[PDB]
Amino acid sequence: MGSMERASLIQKAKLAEQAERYEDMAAFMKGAVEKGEELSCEERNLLSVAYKNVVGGQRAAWRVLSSIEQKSNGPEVREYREKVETELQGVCDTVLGLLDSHLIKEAGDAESRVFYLKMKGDYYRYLAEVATDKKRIIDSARSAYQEAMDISKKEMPPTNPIRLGLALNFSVFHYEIANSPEEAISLAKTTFDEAMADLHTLSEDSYKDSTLIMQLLRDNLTLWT
Amino acid sequence: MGSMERASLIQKAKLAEQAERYEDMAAFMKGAVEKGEELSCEERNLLSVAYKNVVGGQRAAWRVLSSIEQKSNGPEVREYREKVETELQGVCDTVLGLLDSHLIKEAGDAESRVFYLKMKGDYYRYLAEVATDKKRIIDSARSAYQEAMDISKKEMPPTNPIRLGLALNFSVFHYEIANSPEEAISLAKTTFDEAMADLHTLSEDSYKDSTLIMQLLRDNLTLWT
Amino acid sequence: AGSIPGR
Amino acid sequence: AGSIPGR
Ligand SMILES: *Cc1ccc(-n2ccnc2-c2ccccc2Br)cc1Br
Ligand SMILES: *Cc1ccc(-n2ccnc2-c2ccccc2Br)cc1Br
């Protein structure tokens, strides 16, 4: 995407989202990141939405194929699950590479740095879902989430939607990846309760944003308890 | 896909369908066709389902982008609509190439030949939707549908699901492409009525198949009249 | 209007 | 369970 203007890549990413063309969206946003400038808040969201949709479809397909493979236990189901798995790992490696070159190191503000570290934890978590260096991948996810948590607790109010989404995803990591359901439940509860106590400070629009993510925390707590 | 066994390609196409990986599905089925053997009834359906889903997503995206482009009347929306349009045309050309090399010429039975000629009309119709050689593309769609109709009326009962789906799609061609709404309505009505009169000959399972497509004919008639 | 959906 | 959906 080296010959396209940064602003044109961003515009095309927005069009790709409207057209539900998420692979295109991700390629446009990768091109925008590779221009070397920092990303605005809206541009970070475009980057995250694009890759979340791409890897979300891969993960859903991997789960279908892994279930068929486990039920069967010819080489075709394993071969095809392996093909999807390799593609998924390639997308995660691409996102992690963008974060490492050089989005995180240039992110000084808490909002941007927490956003990228949450992404780093998420994409290591997706790698962990298919891994069997499994321990090192899990530790990489945990380390990224933990640094994001530490910054968010110092620099952001408890209702900040990025802080809330980070805590939600880290709790999912604890429950689904790290075999730590009690840590997952504790984190979700503490996060919910501290956000509840801070809602009084918010405008109607911010209240809507924060309460929507609190409902996701409550939905997980209901499923886990 | 030249190094994969035909049976493995078919098995993987079925897995790709279960995983909703339609681009993969289409590539597996293209590889199977290129083995040079005729396709069974089930294999023809896999081929059609795969490409219908691929081109269906392209068509939906093209329509979103074409609407934005018409509302705006920078170069980005036109450029991106053009990119999607070129990709869609490439998929249609690929399918038409498989039909021409050599699925149609080897199809002797009415069920297979009608199936492929209907596909030929459909993919020319998708080309026509984005064309502005528009007349020649429209005539190619019409010619394919007409030959399929002529065979189906001679060789298939009026409730045959392939015959019904062909008539449904040809009626859509008349209404949406050929600017012939009265021909579309007449074809849909005659097709519905002749199928209705033949339902008494069918088993419960065949009755279910035929009546489902008759409902689609009725749905179009309700929208058109 | 509607063509055959195709599964 | 459920992570942040992401639009
Ligand atoms: C990880 C995360 C957390 C919050 C947001 N965010 C910001 C503004 N709205 C949202 C959002 C996104 C998805 C569901 C609900 C909400 Br309130 C974005 C991200 Br990537
Ligand atoms: C073009 C066409 C027409 C009918 C079928 N078909 C055969 C058996 N079932 C179906 C079908 C497919 C989609 C919707 C409803 C029905 Br009854 C397949 C095809 Br490609």
Beta strands in A142-210 (DSSP E): none
Please tell me the distance from the alpha carbon of residue A210 to that of residue B146, in angstroms, as a whole number.
59
Does some domain include residue B1? Answer: no
Could you count the other beta carbons within 10 Å of the beta carbon of residue A74?
A: 10
For ligand 2, whether the C-beta of B60 sits within 6 Å is no
Number of structural domains (chain A) is 1
Does some domain include residue B213? Answer: yes
Give me the residue label for tokens 């699925």.
B103
Burial of A39: CB neighbours in 10 Å, binned 0-12, 13-18, 19+: buried
Give me the residue label for tokens 């997980």.
A220
Q: Which residues of D1-7 are buried (b: 16+ CB within 10 A; e: fewer)?
A: bebbeee
Does some domain include residue A197? Answer: yes
Please provide the size of chain C in residues: 7
Please tell me the distance from the alpha carbon of residue A13 to that of residue A30, in angstroms, as a whole number.
10
Paired tokens of B173: 């061609």
Please tell me the distance from the alpha carbon of residue A106 to that of residue B206, in angstroms, as a whole number.
65
Paired tokens of A13: 């990413």
Which residue's alpha carbon is nearest to atom 15 within ligand 1?
A213
Please tell me the distance from the alpha carbon of residue B56 to that of residue B61, in angstroms, as a whole number.
9
**Which residues on D lie below 8 Å from A224 (Cβ)?**
1
CATH number of the CATH domain containing A131: 1.20.190.20
Q: Which helix (H) or strand (E) holds B197?
A: none
Please tell me the distance from the alpha carbon of residue B210 to that of residue B199, in angstroms, as a whole number.
8
Please tell me the distance from the alpha carbon of residue B51 to that of residue B181, in angstroms, as a whole number.
27
Paired tokens of B93: 């050309």
Q: Which of A20, A12, C6 is nearest to B126 (CA)?
A: C6
SS3 letters across A1-28: CCCCCHHHHHHHHHHHHHCCCHHHHHHH
Q: How was this structure determined?
A: X-ray
DSSP secondary structure string, A76-97?
HHHHHHHHHHHHHHHHHHHHHH
Is the torsion defined by CA of A104, A110, A111, A115 positive or negative?
Answer: positive
Amino acid present at B8: S
Burial of A25: CB neighbours in 10 Å, binned 0-12, 13-18, 19+: buried
A29–chain D Cβ distance below 8 A for any pair: no
Paired tokens of A220: 């997980």
Amino acid present at A131: A
Interface of D with A in 1-7 (CB under 8 A): 1-4, 6-7
Does some domain include residue B201? Answer: yes
Does some domain include residue B53? Answer: yes
**What does this entry list as its resolution, in Å?**
1.3
Domain that holds residue A201: 6-225
- Residue pair A109/A152 in contact by the 8 Å Cβ criterion: no
DSSP secondary structure string, B141-180?
HHHHHHHHHHHHHHHS-TT-HHHHHHHHHHHHHHHHTSS-
Does some domain include residue B57? Answer: yes
SS3 letters across A44-73: HHHHHHHHHHHHHHHHHHHHHHHHHHHHHC
Atom of ligand 1 nearest to the CA of D6: 13
Kindly list the distances between the CA atom of residue A95 and the CA atoms of A27, A60, A117, A131, B189, in Å, as whole numbers in the listed order: 11, 18, 12, 17, 54
- Residue pair B37/B6 in contact by the 8 Å Cβ criterion: yes
Does some domain include residue B159? Answer: yes
Paired tokens of B142: 């019409």
Please tell me the distance from the alpha carbon of residue A181 to that of residue A36, in angstroms, as a whole number.
40
Is the torsion defined by CA of B100, B103, B107, B113 positive or negative?
Answer: negative
Q: Which residues of B191-213 are buried (b: 16+ CB within 10 A; e: fewer)?
A: bbebbeeeeeebeeeeeeebbeb
Please tell me the distance from the alpha carbon of residue A151 to that of residue A116, in angstroms, as a whole number.
12
Kindly list the distances between the CA atom of residue A118 and the CA atoms of A124, A144, A213, in Å, as whole numbers in the listed order: 10, 7, 15
Please tell me the distance from the alpha carbon of residue C1 to that of residue A143, in angstroms, as a whole number.
54
Q: At what angle do helices B22-33 and B76-98 cross, to 10 degrees?
A: 30
Does some domain include residue A1? Answer: no
Please tell me the distance from the alpha carbon of residue B47 to that of residue B94, in angstroms, as a whole number.
12
For ligand 1, whether the C-beta of D5 sits within 6 Å is yes
Please tell me the distance from the alpha carbon of residue A144 to that of residue B58, in angstroms, as a whole number.
37
CA atoms within 13 A on the CB side of A63: 8
